[PDB]
């Protein structure tokens, strides 16, 4: 007998059907398209401008960072106040 064709992983980008309700959610999430671009990029067909955050996303990121990450000068001033208090 002759062997069957070997199982080969396709290197072409694969996009699931967004209108089929049987497709999973992780295959429609934006991270799926981002990873498809990272894998192929050219043959993927993903707008490279979408990899960066949008305006509202940038604003929310800046708010989060300014609320949960103090500046180096402010942190040094807080540390100086604390060491002065201990002294």
């Amino acid at each position: 007998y002759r062997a069957r064709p070997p199982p080969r992983r396709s290197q072409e980008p694969r996009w699931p059907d967004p209108d089929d309700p049987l497709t999973p959610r992780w295959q429609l999430s934006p991270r799926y398209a981002a990873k498809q671009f990272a894998r192929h990029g050219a043959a993927s067909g993903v707008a490279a401008g979408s990899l960066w955050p949008s305006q509202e996303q940038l604003r929310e990121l800046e708010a989060e960072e300014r609320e949960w990450y103090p500046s180096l000068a402010a942190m040094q001033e807080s540390l100086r106040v604390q060491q002065l208090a201990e002294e």
Binding site: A48, G49, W52
Partner: protein
Amino acid sequence: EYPSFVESVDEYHFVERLLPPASIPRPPKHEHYPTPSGWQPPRDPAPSLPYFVRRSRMHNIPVYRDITHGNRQMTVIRKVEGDIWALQKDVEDFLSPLLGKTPVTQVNEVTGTLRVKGYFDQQLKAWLLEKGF
């Protein structure tokens, strides 16, 4: 409202440094042996011994120590090709004056492995280095 981007190939030589090698690089040739880390390559020709202790994939001597039951200490010499009984005889002749008696040994011939009863890893490593393996 997609932001504009620039596509460049100039800074892609930095990405080559972030790719780990899938193989192990051969040790560089030094002007003096042994190296400061104590490493030493084998001799250029093969010795006339009827056995060959092949180096590990990291270019180290395959002499390890093993513990069993929390109190049984053994020393394992691996990667032996040839008359393993000659290597066993040489090991017993080398370890007899150190202990005053013939050391207990097991010879796995189908595996090419020697197993001495006790911790003699450093001494066996130095002995194999003197023998040029």
